Design an enzyme around this catalytic site. Sequence first.
Site, PDB file in Angstrom:
ATOM      1  CG  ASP B  94      -1.873   1.096   1.288  1.00 54.05           C
ATOM      2  OD1 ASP B  94      -1.508   2.218   1.674  1.00 54.05           O
ATOM      3  OD2 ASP B  94      -3.016   0.845   0.905  1.00 54.05           O
ATOM      4  CG  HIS B  95       2.787   2.069   3.457  1.00 56.09           C
ATOM      5  ND1 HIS B  95       3.267   2.138   4.750  1.00 56.09           N
ATOM      6  CD2 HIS B  95       1.434   2.101   3.502  1.00 56.09           C
ATOM      7  CE1 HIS B  95       2.199   2.199   5.530  1.00 56.09           C
ATOM      8  NE2 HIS B  95       1.078   2.165   4.827  1.00 56.09           N
ATOM      9  CG  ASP B  96       5.865   0.185  -4.233  1.00 54.83           C
ATOM     10  OD1 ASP B  96       5.894   1.049  -5.140  1.00 54.83           O
ATOM     11  OD2 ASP B  96       6.580  -0.837  -4.251  1.00 54.83           O
TER      12      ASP B  96
HETATM   13  C1  HEM Z   1      -1.904  -2.337  12.028  1.00 52.56           C
HETATM   14  C2  HEM Z   1      -1.366  -1.823  10.870  1.00 52.56           C
HETATM   15  C3  HEM Z   1      -1.904  -0.692  10.092  1.00 52.56           C
HETATM   16  C4  HEM Z   1      -2.089   0.518  10.593  1.00 52.56           C
HETATM   17  C5  HEM Z   1      -1.820   0.907  12.019  1.00 52.56           C
HETATM   18  C6  HEM Z   1      -2.678   1.299   9.591  1.00 52.56           C
HETATM   19  C7  HEM Z   1      -2.993   2.625   9.839  1.00 52.56           C
HETATM   20  C8  HEM Z   1      -3.571   3.420   8.905  1.00 52.56           C
HETATM   21  C9  HEM Z   1      -3.865   4.763   9.190  1.00 52.56           C
HETATM   22  C10 HEM Z   1      -3.732   5.421  10.542  1.00 52.56           C
HETATM   23  C11 HEM Z   1      -4.210   5.311   7.982  1.00 52.56           C
HETATM   24  C12 HEM Z   1      -4.609   6.748   7.698  1.00 52.56           C
HETATM   25  C13 HEM Z   1      -6.111   6.854   8.103  1.00 52.56           C
HETATM   26  C14 HEM Z   1      -6.830   8.187   7.778  1.00 52.56           C
HETATM   27  O1  HEM Z   1      -6.665   9.262   8.343  1.00 52.56           O
HETATM   28  O2  HEM Z   1      -7.734   8.234   6.816  1.00 52.56           O
HETATM   29  C15 HEM Z   1      -4.185   4.218   7.037  1.00 52.56           C
HETATM   30  C16 HEM Z   1      -4.482   4.342   5.739  1.00 52.56           C
HETATM   31  C17 HEM Z   1      -4.406   3.313   4.845  1.00 52.56           C
HETATM   32  N1  HEM Z   1      -4.175   2.030   5.053  1.00 52.56           N
HETATM   33 FE1  HEM Z   1      -3.844   1.216   6.807  1.00 52.56          FE
HETATM   34  N2  HEM Z   1      -2.921   0.602   8.439  1.00 52.56           N
HETATM   35  C18 HEM Z   1      -2.412  -0.634   8.694  1.00 52.56           C
HETATM   36  C19 HEM Z   1      -2.487  -1.725   7.822  1.00 52.56           C
HETATM   37  C20 HEM Z   1      -2.987  -1.636   6.505  1.00 52.56           C
HETATM   38  C21 HEM Z   1      -3.059  -2.748   5.609  1.00 52.56           C
HETATM   39  C22 HEM Z   1      -2.659  -4.171   5.977  1.00 52.56           C
HETATM   40  C23 HEM Z   1      -3.562  -2.261   4.394  1.00 52.56           C
HETATM   41  C24 HEM Z   1      -3.827  -3.004   3.126  1.00 52.56           C
HETATM   42  C25 HEM Z   1      -3.539  -4.289   2.946  1.00 52.56           C
HETATM   43  C26 HEM Z   1      -3.748  -0.846   4.590  1.00 52.56           C
HETATM   44  C27 HEM Z   1      -4.093   0.063   3.583  1.00 52.56           C
HETATM   45  C28 HEM Z   1      -4.254   1.438   3.833  1.00 52.56           C
HETATM   46  C29 HEM Z   1      -4.466   2.460   2.828  1.00 52.56           C
HETATM   47  C30 HEM Z   1      -4.595   2.410   1.346  1.00 52.56           C
HETATM   48  C31 HEM Z   1      -4.597   3.585   3.451  1.00 52.56           C
HETATM   49  C32 HEM Z   1      -4.698   4.958   2.806  1.00 52.56           C
HETATM   50  C33 HEM Z   1      -3.247   5.255   2.275  1.00 52.56           C
HETATM   51  C34 HEM Z   1      -3.089   6.689   1.813  1.00 52.56           C
HETATM   52  O3  HEM Z   1      -3.320   7.013   0.693  1.00 52.56           O
HETATM   53  O4  HEM Z   1      -2.704   7.690   2.608  1.00 52.56           O
HETATM   54  N3  HEM Z   1      -3.487  -0.489   5.918  1.00 52.56           N
HETATM   55  N4  HEM Z   1      -3.855   3.019   7.597  1.00 52.56           N
HETATM   56 CA    CA Z   2       5.700   3.372  -6.194  1.00 51.11          CA
END
Ligand code: HEM
Ligand code: CA
Lengths: 464, 103
Positions: B94-96
Site C-alpha cells: 500500500d506504501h509503494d
Molecule cells: C496495524 C497496521 C496498520 C495501521 C496501524 C494502519 C494505519 C492506517 C492509518 C492510521 C491510515 C490513515 C487513516 C486516515 O486518516 O484516513 C491508514 C491508511 C491506509 N491504510 Fe492502513 N494501516 C495498517 C495496515 C494496513 C493494511 C494491511 C492495508 C492493506 C492491505 C492498509 C491500507 C491502507 C491504505 C490504502 C490507506 C490509505 C493510504 C493513503 O493514501 O494515505 N493499511 N492506515
Molecule cells: Ca511506487
Amino acid sequence: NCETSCVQQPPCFPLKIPPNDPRIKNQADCIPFFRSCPACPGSNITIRNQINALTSFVDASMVYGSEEPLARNLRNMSNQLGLLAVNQRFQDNGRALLPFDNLHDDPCLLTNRSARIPCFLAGDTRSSEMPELTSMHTLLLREHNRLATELKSLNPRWDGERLYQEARKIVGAMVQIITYRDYLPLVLGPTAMRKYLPTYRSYNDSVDPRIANVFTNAFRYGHTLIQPFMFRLDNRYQPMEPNPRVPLSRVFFASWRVVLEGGIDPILRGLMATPAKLNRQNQIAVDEIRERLFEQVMRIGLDLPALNMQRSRDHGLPGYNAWRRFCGLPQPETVGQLGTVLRNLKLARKLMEQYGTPNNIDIWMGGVSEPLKRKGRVGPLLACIIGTQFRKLRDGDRFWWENEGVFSMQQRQALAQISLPRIICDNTGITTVSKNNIFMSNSYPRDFVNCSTLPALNLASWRE
Amino acid sequence: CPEQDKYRTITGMCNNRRSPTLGASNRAFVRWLPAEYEDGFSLPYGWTPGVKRNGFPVALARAVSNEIVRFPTDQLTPDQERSLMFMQWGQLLDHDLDFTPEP
Ligand code: HEM
Ligand SMILES: [Ca+2]
Ligand SMILES: *[C@@H]1O[C@H](CO)[C@@H](O[C@@H]2O[C@H](CO)[C@@H](O)[C@H](O)[C@H]2NC(C)=O)[C@H](O)[C@H]1NC(C)=O
Ligand SMILES: [Cl-]
C-alpha cells in the site's frame, strides 16, 4: 488546530461523539481529523480532489522514495559502491538497520521516554508506524546493499550509479513478483484473479497507471486482517520472553522495540508463523485499532474503521450502490435485497439502521460487509476495485519486469525463482523460512522449511 | 523527456511518454466516478447539520464503527489459510502505491 480542537472549521472535519459511546463518555470531545489536501487549494470551479504523494507503480518507492531530494539522502554518498545509507548508531546482531530521521515532534521518542529512539528514514514516511512494517523495510534496504555488493564482485568496472539502479531494478521486480504471483491471487481468489488479472501480454501506453481515489479507501480492507498483538518468536519459533504477545496499542511508532528488543528477527518470525485475523460479518476489526489507534502518541486513541469512513466522505466518494453499479454488480434497494447480497439479513437490517439506504453505505463499510470470494479474502465489490487497480499498475508500467526490453530472457528466468522466504534467508539470521506460498503458510513446523532447500537468485545473467 | 532510457525516474515522471505525469508522485488521483459532496464541489457529507444524503440522514462514522465493526476481542477467529505476513505485505505494498497528504 485539528489535533486539539472539536470546532468544525477548515481544514478540520472532526468525528462527532454518539450518545452511549463504549469509550468516549464525553460528547463535547471528538476524534480528530484533517481534511486531505486539495489538489486545487481554494477553488470554486474544480470538484475537490486529493493528491497521491507517491509513484503509483510497483517500483519499490517505499525503499527509494518518490521525490529526488529524499532519494539522494537515502543513498550512501561516501563511496562508488552504489549503496543505500544505513543506521550509524545501532545494528541488528551485525546486520544493517534503517537510518534515523531528524524530526521536529518525533512520535517515536514518545513511545518510550527513557529509550530516546527516534523514527526511521525510508522511501516512505510511514516506516516507523508498526515494527512489523519497519522490519519489512529493514529487510528490503538490506537486499539493495546485498544486490549492489554481489553486483560489484560480478562487474567491478561498474560505477556507483550503475550499481544503485541495477540493485533498484531487481528489488522493484521482486516486489512485483511477490505481489502478482503470491499476494494478489490470495486476495482476489481464483475467479477474480482470472477476470481482473488475465495473463500479461505486454505494456500498453493507453492504460492509465494512476491510483483511483476509491482505491485508497478500498485497499483499507487490510484493516480487517489486523491481529490485536505483535507476535515475537525465538530461533525455535516459541514465544520470545519478555513481551511475546505485546498489544498493538503499545507498538505503534514504538521503533525502540526494533533497536532495543532483539531486532527484526523475532518480528519477522512472528509474521511467518502467526495466523492473520479472519474477516467475519460479526468480527470486522479489532478494538486495538478501533478504540486505541495511537493511544501513546496522541491526546486520544483513534478509531481506524471510523477514520476510513470519514476519509471516504472527505474524498467525496460515492456510496455502496454507485460502486456496485460501476463494477457491473446488482444494486440492492431494500433490506431483503441487501440481505440476499450480503447473505446475512442481521447485518442488512443493521446497515439499514445506520444508513437508511444501500446507496449511503460508505465504500469501506459496504466493501468489508460482503461474503468473501472462494479462496480469496475480499467480496465481489472490493475484488473489482482492487483487481482493476492492479491490472492498470501492471499493463500500464513501461518498466514492468516482463515487458520486452526491461530484462533479458535469462534475467527473467533468474528473477522467476525469487520468493519472500529466500529474501528473509538472504538478509537475516532466520534459518527456518516458510514453505511457498509465504502468505498461506502460518503454522510451525507443518508449513516450515530449511534455507538449504531454497534456491537463491543467481545474478550470472547480469554479467556484462 | 529522454528518447531512450534504462532506468525509472524517482518520481515516476516519463514512464508514460504521451502523458509524462501519469503514475508520477505529487499529482491528483484519477477518478473512476464523479465526486459526491454536500455542495457538489467541496463540503463532505456530514459537514452541515440537518443536510440529508440521498434522502436519508448521514450516520456518524463512529456510530457505524460502534454498531457494525465493534466485537469482543476474545471471540476472534484466526485465518487457518493466511499468515500475518499476508497482512504486513499488504500494508508495505500500500506504501509503494499511495499516500494522501493532509495539512
Ligand atoms: C496495524 C497496521 C496498520 C495501521 C496501524 C494502519 C494505519 C492506517 C492509518 C492510521 C491510515 C490513515 C487513516 C486516515 O486518516 O484516513 C491508514 C491508511 C491506509 N491504510 Fe492502513 N494501516 C495498517 C495496515 C494496513 C493494511 C494491511 C492495508 C492493506 C492491505 C492498509 C491500507 C491502507 C491504505 C490504502 C490507506 C490509505 C493510504 C493513503 O493514501 O494515505 N493499511 N492506515
Ligand atoms: Ca511506487
Ligand atoms: C522502554 O525502554 C527501556 C530501555 O531503555 C526499557 O527498559 C528495560 O526494561 C526491562 C523491564 O523488564 C529490563 O530488561 C530493564 O530494566 C530495562 N533496560 C534498560 C537498559 O533500561 C523499558 O522497560 C521501556 N519502558 C516501558 C515503560 O516499557
Ligand atoms: Cl475514484
